[PDB]
Design a protein around this ligand. Sequence first.
Ligand SMILES: C[C@H](OC(=O)c1ccc(CN)cc1)c1cccc2c(-c3ccc(CS(C)(=O)=O)c(Cl)c3)c(C(=O)O)[nH]c12
Ligand SMILES: [Zn+2]
Ligand SMILES: [Zn+2]
Length: 232
Amino acid sequence: SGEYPTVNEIPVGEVRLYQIADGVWSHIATQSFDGAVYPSNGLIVRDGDELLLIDTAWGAKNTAALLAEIEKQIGLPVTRAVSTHFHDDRVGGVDVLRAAGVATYASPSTRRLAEAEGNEIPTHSLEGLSSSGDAVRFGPVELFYPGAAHSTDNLVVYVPSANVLYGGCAVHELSSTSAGNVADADLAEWPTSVERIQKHYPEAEVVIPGHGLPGGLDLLQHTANVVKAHKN
Ligand SMILES: C[C@H](OC(=O)c1ccc(CN)cc1)c1cccc2c(-c3ccc(CS(C)(=O)=O)c(Cl)c3)c(C(=O)O)[nH]c12
Ligand SMILES: [Zn+2]
Ligand SMILES: [Zn+2]
């Protein structure tokens, strides 16, 4: 159909790519957790004759499959990866990346939390992101720390060439009916963090959530709405 691929269409272990814009893809994979199956997204951004990866494919074997799919579909080497928070859907697979020549990065907050939780740990620390509203450049993207939301360390990623906003797990898809896995969330700060994203990226054309279908800037307001209803 060429439509964005949904949880039931992706067996656990296989990875899909979806072209978002020129030089921008999402990657989609599925994983089992606590007896249910979930999709999750990441991003790929062309960086000259190399690629920048945002987030793993949620597990070691999924991430190996991601690398194979990139080779098949794109054929440029992944040289760097950024993980946007410490959960396994973002860092699970960092060891696979590190053994495939990829330099792995995350904020110091993410690295601390990953280490404390027993999740895989990116090698390199991203300074300059410790206060909400902070932004830094990283190859063809901007990394932005909006404040605590889904997690206290969550980062969002903007692709200025294409006006693509990758919200990661701080942003939910339009069909969502709850705020996802909130165990490490700050439901009270989340709307404020989303407002910071809205103010900083008003020209975003595509908004990609951490899980589920991309859309437009409405994903941000919807996220605030579902989080408020969850807190309530
Ligand atoms: C890998 C990730 O682990 C955690 O978070 C986690 C938190 C604490 C512990 C305890 N040490 C362990 C693991 C995770 C595991 C399993 C599921 C998720 C979901 C998710 C996403 C969407 C929906 C549909 S929705 C919006 O309509 O609710 C749902 Cl149900 C869940 C999300 C997310 O929200 O980012 N992260 C998910
Ligand atoms: Zn998470
Ligand atoms: Zn998530």
